[PDB]
Design an enzyme around this catalytic site. Structure first.
Site, short mmCIF file in Angstrom:
data_model
loop_
_atom_site.label_atom_id
_atom_site.label_comp_id
_atom_site.label_asym_id
_atom_site.label_seq_id
_atom_site.Cartn_x
_atom_site.Cartn_y
_atom_site.Cartn_z
N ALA A 110 0.79 -1.22 0.00
CA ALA A 110 0.00 0.00 0.00
C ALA A 110 0.83 1.28 0.00
O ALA A 110 0.34 2.34 -0.40
CB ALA A 110 -0.98 0.00 1.17
N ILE A 154 4.60 1.45 -0.83
CA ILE A 154 5.69 1.53 -1.80
C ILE A 154 5.19 2.28 -3.03
O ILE A 154 4.28 1.82 -3.72
CB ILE A 154 6.21 0.14 -2.24
CG1 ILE A 154 6.90 -0.58 -1.08
CG2 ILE A 154 7.18 0.29 -3.39
CD1 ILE A 154 8.18 0.07 -0.64
N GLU A 199 5.36 3.53 -6.72
CA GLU A 199 3.98 3.05 -6.82
C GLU A 199 3.86 2.91 -8.32
O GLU A 199 3.21 2.02 -8.87
CB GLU A 199 2.94 4.10 -6.43
CG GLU A 199 1.51 3.59 -6.43
CD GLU A 199 0.93 3.53 -5.03
OE1 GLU A 199 0.79 2.40 -4.49
OE2 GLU A 199 0.62 4.60 -4.47
N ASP A 258 10.37 34.14 -36.31
CA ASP A 258 10.39 34.80 -37.59
C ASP A 258 9.27 35.81 -37.61
O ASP A 258 8.38 35.78 -36.77
CB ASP A 258 10.25 33.80 -38.72
CG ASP A 258 11.53 33.10 -39.02
OD1 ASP A 258 12.36 33.72 -39.72
OD2 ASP A 258 11.70 31.95 -38.55
N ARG A 274 18.55 34.84 -56.40
CA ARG A 274 19.19 35.82 -55.50
C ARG A 274 20.19 36.74 -56.18
O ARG A 274 20.27 37.91 -55.84
CB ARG A 274 19.84 35.17 -54.29
CG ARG A 274 18.89 34.95 -53.15
CD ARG A 274 19.67 34.58 -51.92
NE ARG A 274 18.85 33.97 -50.88
CZ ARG A 274 19.32 33.56 -49.71
NH1 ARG A 274 20.61 33.72 -49.42
NH2 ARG A 274 18.51 33.01 -48.81
N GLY A 326 13.29 39.48 -42.64
CA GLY A 326 14.03 39.55 -43.88
C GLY A 326 13.83 40.91 -44.53
O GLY A 326 14.34 41.16 -45.63
N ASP A 367 10.60 26.84 -40.73
CA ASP A 367 9.57 26.29 -41.61
C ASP A 367 10.12 25.64 -42.86
O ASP A 367 9.50 24.74 -43.42
CB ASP A 367 8.56 27.37 -42.01
CG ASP A 367 9.22 28.64 -42.49
OD1 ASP A 367 9.65 29.44 -41.62
OD2 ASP A 367 9.30 28.86 -43.73
N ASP A 394 15.81 25.41 -42.34
CA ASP A 394 15.66 25.72 -40.93
C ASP A 394 15.95 24.49 -40.10
O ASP A 394 16.06 24.56 -38.87
CB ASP A 394 14.27 26.26 -40.60
CG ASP A 394 13.99 27.59 -41.27
OD1 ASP A 394 14.84 28.51 -41.16
OD2 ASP A 394 12.94 27.72 -41.92
N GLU A 434 1.20 6.73 6.15
CA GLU A 434 0.87 5.31 6.25
C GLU A 434 2.01 4.56 6.94
O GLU A 434 1.79 3.87 7.93
CB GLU A 434 0.57 4.73 4.87
CG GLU A 434 -0.74 5.22 4.25
CD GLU A 434 -1.06 4.54 2.92
OE1 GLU A 434 -0.15 3.92 2.33
OE2 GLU A 434 -2.23 4.62 2.46
N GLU A 448 -6.46 12.89 4.60
CA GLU A 448 -6.18 12.66 3.18
C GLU A 448 -6.96 13.64 2.30
O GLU A 448 -6.47 14.05 1.24
CB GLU A 448 -6.52 11.22 2.78
CG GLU A 448 -5.41 10.21 3.03
CD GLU A 448 -4.19 10.46 2.15
OE1 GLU A 448 -4.11 9.85 1.07
OE2 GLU A 448 -3.31 11.26 2.55
MG LIG Z 1 0.41 0.88 -3.08
MG LIG Z 2 -2.24 5.35 -2.95
MG LIG Z 3 9.25 33.39 -43.17
#
Ligand SMILES: [Mg+2]
Ligand SMILES: [Mg+2]
Ligand SMILES: [Mg+2]
Ligand SMILES: [K+]
Lengths: 985, 31
Positions: A299, A301, A303, A345, A483, A620, A697, A701, A765, A899
């Site tokens: 109960a 540990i 878990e 960008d 270019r 740009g 994009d 890139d 516990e 609890e």
């Molecule tokens: Mg347990």
């Molecule tokens: Mg529990």
């Molecule tokens: Mg762009």
């Protein structure tokens, strides 16, 4: 179709009876989809709810407890007992099912993220003349598909025609060829050929690195090259996040110490084994105190703490997708709330990419060396052809200006794009590049020939005036952009002819940098006169003023070559002669266009400030415009000084490296930069230990997106750029990035408040069960009682935590430190301090009925420590009523109640209840009641309290449970208080 | 999504149906 690669190209079309010109008709598609099925692999889906609960009952501890229970029953048969092993199983089966649903919903959610972006392909089919972008699972053999640079190839495809000078493909994921390979369209004669030798195929799952091409689909689904491979395995990466390990290790540590304490509780009793349990036969005495020892074990540990990380993810990533942040890498969700710099960008991310030409000019008078400009503006900023050309804010008819006529003629022919009316959204939408469709709308708005558009319908009106220009000039070919010259041009000839291969013109459009040096003449109306110094300077000066002011317009220079070369004398294979084809030009005019800031960016950048996140525009535009845009959107002040906070990529390349690293620390605006520069920047930022999110994009890139801490791809972008990424923005929005970063911070705090609840509940516990033995007390809790409480809490309040709100003032804090440990040394204190209280209280409740209770046995400061046999009568002159259900029903009560209280405490990490009230999470309030109605159920029913060993509690008893429990909210509030102010948390 | 509230309600159902069976096991073994 088999060995398509060996069949020639006519033969593939022929085999499926398909036209290259139109593609499959609707019927052919149905038939082929009937026959070949969808372009998918079959959904494996192999698991079951039945199986998984069984698989949970395969771990040792759970079996041991069941064995302990069996043995105990068999032995004491001689003279519940028996219901205990049965109810243990049931609760364990109950807890198991809940835990399985928990795990599977989380898995499905994560898996469901793929739904936010289905694989898509582009086909040509006969019911539409244009290219169609369909879901790839609806691609069938014989489809004519199209691919271009950046695409992820949708099916195994024979190549039909290469539209580039070169098609170039990345098939590494398939053939292992790490470099890109080229393709052709001639056949590969050998049928038995090996993938790498089918230089005429594009296989599925493969990227295009360069080029554009058209092909016919030969095989889809499992029949594909990659299908055959993907069918074998998975082939699952199979987790886990880096934080999941750091916290896993802490799970191991803690789990160990609980094991030690679990064995140690057994040995406290190892002298008590022969006391009547009863009457102390060693084997019965042993197994009793061994159910306890292993009950607390199973109960407490913990878990499935990685279960907690893989749940907050599932919740949070769902949220981010609903807010247009589609997460591809789950690791990055953790490092996302650490983001400290965002390079973004501009076009379409900080702005909106809705272009619209909204000033323009042409030449007016030209006296000697100086010139007058004729200069107009245009209203309407959508793509709709609704607006007017003004002059001096007076509407005017654009055809009255012969200069305007030619400027509009240019904008119609140097254009690869178009307007289309969307009868469903009822809006005019773009087809092609935004910057081009903005020229398209301008020609519509101008209407230089005065053709009769008022009476047409939206649909036919959408390209009416553009069509008239084409009916006038036949576009023969296009000199694509390069270019080296920063322009493109079209070679047109006049409408009517009979060879007659003459009369022709070239219409050139591009950037002024490129275009103007190449103009020898200026068009004044329909006449032309020599371009000269002061004229050039005049044009340039206006282009500048438009750039740096108010609306910050990017400008196109439009020109014409009045005597182009002969058709016979031009060649289009090598792009580099086009700058000489476009010489001896005649200047016409300039269009300046607007690209409006996003509506939420300005406020978004302010949120990054409040949250200590630097934002860097990478645009740009020339530098001047860039800076004007930064001021408009709040990167800079209205009058801030930035001659050292904004760099041209060229300026940036002349700083010694020492000073480039420097600039990156203060710079918030980079203009006119190379793709190399994206990585350069990330490198420098990295050297200051900054967590950088970079956008991107295009294929180029890819490197910087990989190299960034968080690569963020545009959804409208390329498949190639998205694989490089950890997030894709569905709406391309900057504001989406910031909402992603916020949710990052929110999730992390939700992880932190999940585990604070698990650990402190488990620690209590352990404590109570330990104290009850270490002090020599009666058992405050039967093993059966424990698993019950543990069932309720994991089922209701624990789940209810997933539906918490984002913590408060979450972005008035600075970025989390990377490497800041998940559990602070201080934090571990709270886990213990709160946890201890739980255990201290729950047994302090059993101890109370045994002493100060009026209807209880007066044992004030007397040894309840005294051994449970107790018939000796040395301190009692009674006698063994210590096995009462009353003490446990305060222990069980205070535990169940605390609890819930300690769950209210888990609403925020540090924030109080008077600031984040109990009612910030109603589901939690709901779950508490639902829990409380079960505790009240197993208490009063009458068959069950005998199994759970419980007695009713009057309003005298439940009262104390408030006084005992509630201060756990007091205590944590105190702890949280010390945090908020002293801890700087 | 309101899938979240269904998740919690379905959890409450199981530990109710669990408590139910024990009421059914008590009477059953008793007679
Ligand atoms: Mg347990
Ligand atoms: Mg529990
Ligand atoms: Mg762009
Ligand atoms: K990255």
């Amino acid at each position: 179709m088999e060995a398509a690669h060996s069949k020639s190209t006519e033969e593939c079309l022929a085999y499926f009876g398909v036209s290259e010109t139109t593609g499959l008709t609707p019927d052919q598609v149905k038939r082929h989809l009937e026959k070949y099925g969808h372009n998918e692999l079959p959904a494996e889906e192999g698991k079951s709810l039945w199986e998984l609960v069984i698989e949970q009952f395969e771990d040792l501890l759970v079996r041991i407890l069941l064995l302990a229970a069996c043995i105990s029953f068999v032995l004491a048969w001689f003279e519940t007992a028996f219901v205990e092993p049965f109810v243990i199983l049931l609760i364990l089966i109950a807890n198991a099912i809940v835990g399985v649903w928990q795990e599977r919903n989380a898995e499905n959610a994560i898996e469901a993220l793929k739904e936010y972006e289905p694989e898509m392909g582009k086909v040509y089919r006969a019911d539409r003349k244009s290219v169609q972008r369909i879901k790839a699972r609806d691609i069938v053999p014989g489809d004519i598909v199209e691919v271009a640079v950046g695409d992820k190839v949708p099916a195994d495809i024979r190549i039909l025609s290469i539209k580039s000078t070169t098609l170039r493909v990345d098939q590494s994921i398939l053939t292992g060829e790490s470099v890109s390979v080229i393709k052709h369209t001639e056949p590969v004669p050998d049928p038995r050929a090996v993938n790498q030798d089918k230089k005429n195929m594009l296989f599925s799952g493969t990227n295009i690195a360069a080029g554009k091409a058209l092909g016919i689909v030969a095989t889809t689904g499992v029949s594909t090259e990659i299908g055959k491979i993907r069918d074998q395995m998975a082939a699952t990466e199979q987790d886990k996040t880096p934080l999941q390990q750091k916290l896993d290790e802490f799970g191991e540590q803690l789990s160990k110490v609980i094991s030690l304490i679990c064995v140690a509780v057994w040995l406290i009793n190892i002298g008590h084994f022969n006391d009547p349990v009863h009457g102390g036969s060693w084997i019965r005495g042993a197994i009793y105190y061994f159910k306890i020892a292993v009950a607390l074990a199973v109960a407490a540990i913990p878990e499935g703490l990685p279960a907690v990380i893989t749940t907050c993810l599932a919740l949070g990533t769902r949220r981010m997708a609903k807010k247009n942040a589609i997460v591809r890498s789950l690791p990055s969700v953790e490092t996302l709330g650490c983001t400290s710099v965002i390079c973004s960008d501009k076009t379409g991310t900080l702005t909106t990419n809705q272009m619209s030409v909204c000033k323009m000019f042409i030449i007016d008078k030209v006296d000697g060396d100086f010139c007058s400009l004729n200069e107009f503006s245009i209203t309407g900023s959508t793509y709709a052809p609704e607006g007017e050309v003004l002059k001096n804010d007076k509407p005017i008819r654009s055809g009255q200006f012969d200069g305007l006529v030619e400027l509009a003629t240019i904008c119609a022919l140097c254009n690869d794009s178009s307007l289309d009316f969307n009868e469903t959204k009822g809006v005019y939408e773009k087809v092609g590049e935004a910057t081009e469709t903005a020229l398209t709308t301008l020609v519509e708005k101008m209407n230089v020939f005065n053709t009769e558009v008022r009476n047409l319908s939206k649909v036919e009106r959408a390209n009416a005036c553009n069509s008239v220009i084409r009916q006038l000039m036949k576009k023969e070919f296009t000199l694509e952009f390069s270019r080296d010259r920063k322009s493109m041009s079209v070679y047109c000839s006049p409408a009517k002819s009979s060879r007659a291969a003459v009369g022709n013109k070239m219409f050139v459009k591009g950037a002024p940098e490129g275009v103007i040096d190449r103009c020898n003449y200026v068009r004044v109306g329909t006449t032309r006169v020599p371009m000269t110094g002061p004229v050039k300077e005049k044009i340039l000066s206006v282009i500048k003023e438009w750039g740096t002011g108010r609306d910050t317009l990017r400008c196109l220079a439009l020109a014409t070559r009045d005597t182009p070369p002969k058709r016979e004398e031009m060649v289009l294979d090598d792009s580099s002669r086009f700058m000489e084809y476009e010489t001896d030009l005649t200047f016409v005019g300039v269009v300046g266009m607007l690209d409006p800031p996003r509506k939420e960016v300005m406020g978004s950048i302010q949120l990054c400030r409040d949250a200590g996140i630097r934002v860097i525009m990478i645009t740009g535009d020339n530098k001047g415009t860039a800076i004007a845009i930064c001021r408009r959107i709040g990167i800079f002040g209205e009058n801030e000084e930035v001659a050292d906070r904004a760099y041209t990529g060229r300026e940036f390349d002349d700083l010694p490296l020492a000073e480039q690293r420097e600039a990156c620390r203060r710079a918030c605006c980079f203009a006119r930069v190379e793709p190399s520069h994206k990585s350069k920047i990330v490198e420098y930022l990295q050297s200051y230990d900054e967590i950088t999110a970079m956008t991107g994009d295009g294929v180029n890139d890819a490197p910087a997106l990989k190299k960034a801490e968080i690569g963020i791809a545009m959804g409208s972008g390329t498949a190639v750029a998205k694989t490089a990424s950890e997030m894709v923005l569905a709406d391309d929005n900057f504001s989406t990035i910031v909402a992603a970063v916020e949710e990052g911070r929110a999730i992390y705090n939700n992880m932190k408040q999940f585990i604070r609840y698990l650990i402190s509940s488990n620690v209590g516990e352990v404590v109570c069960i330990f104290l009850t033995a270490a002090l020599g007390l009666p058992e405050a809790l039967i093993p059966v009682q424990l698993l019950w409480v543990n069932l309720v809490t994991d089922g209701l309040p624990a789940t209810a935590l997933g539906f918490n709100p984002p913590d408060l003032d979450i972005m008035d804090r600075p970025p989390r430190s990377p490497k800041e440990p998940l559990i602070s040394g201080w934090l571990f204190f709270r886990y213990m301090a709160i946890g201890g209280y739980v255990g201290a209280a729950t047994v302090g409740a059993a101890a109370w009925w045994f002493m100060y209770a009026e209807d209880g046995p007066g044992v004030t400061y007397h040894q309840l420590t005294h051994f449970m046999q107790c018939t000796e009568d040395h301190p009692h002159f009674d006698c063994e009523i210590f096995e009462a259900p009353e003490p446990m029903t305060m222990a069980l009560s205070v535990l169940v109640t605390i609890e819930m209280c300690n769950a209210l405490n888990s609403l925020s990490e540090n924030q109080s209840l008077m600031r984040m009230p109990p009612w910030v999470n109603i589901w939690l309030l709901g779950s508490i009641c639902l829990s409380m109605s079960l505790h009240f159920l197993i208490l009063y029913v009458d068959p069950l309290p005998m199994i759970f060993k419980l007695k009713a509690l009057d309003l005298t008893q439940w009262l104390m449970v408030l006084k005992i429990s509630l201060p756990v909210i007091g205590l944590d509030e105190i702890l949280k208080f010390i945090a908020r102010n002293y801890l700087e948390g | 999504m309101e899938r979240s509230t269904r998740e919690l309600c379905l959890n409450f159902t199981v530990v109710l149906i669990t408590v139910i069976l024990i009421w059914l096991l008590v009477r059953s073994y008793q007679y």
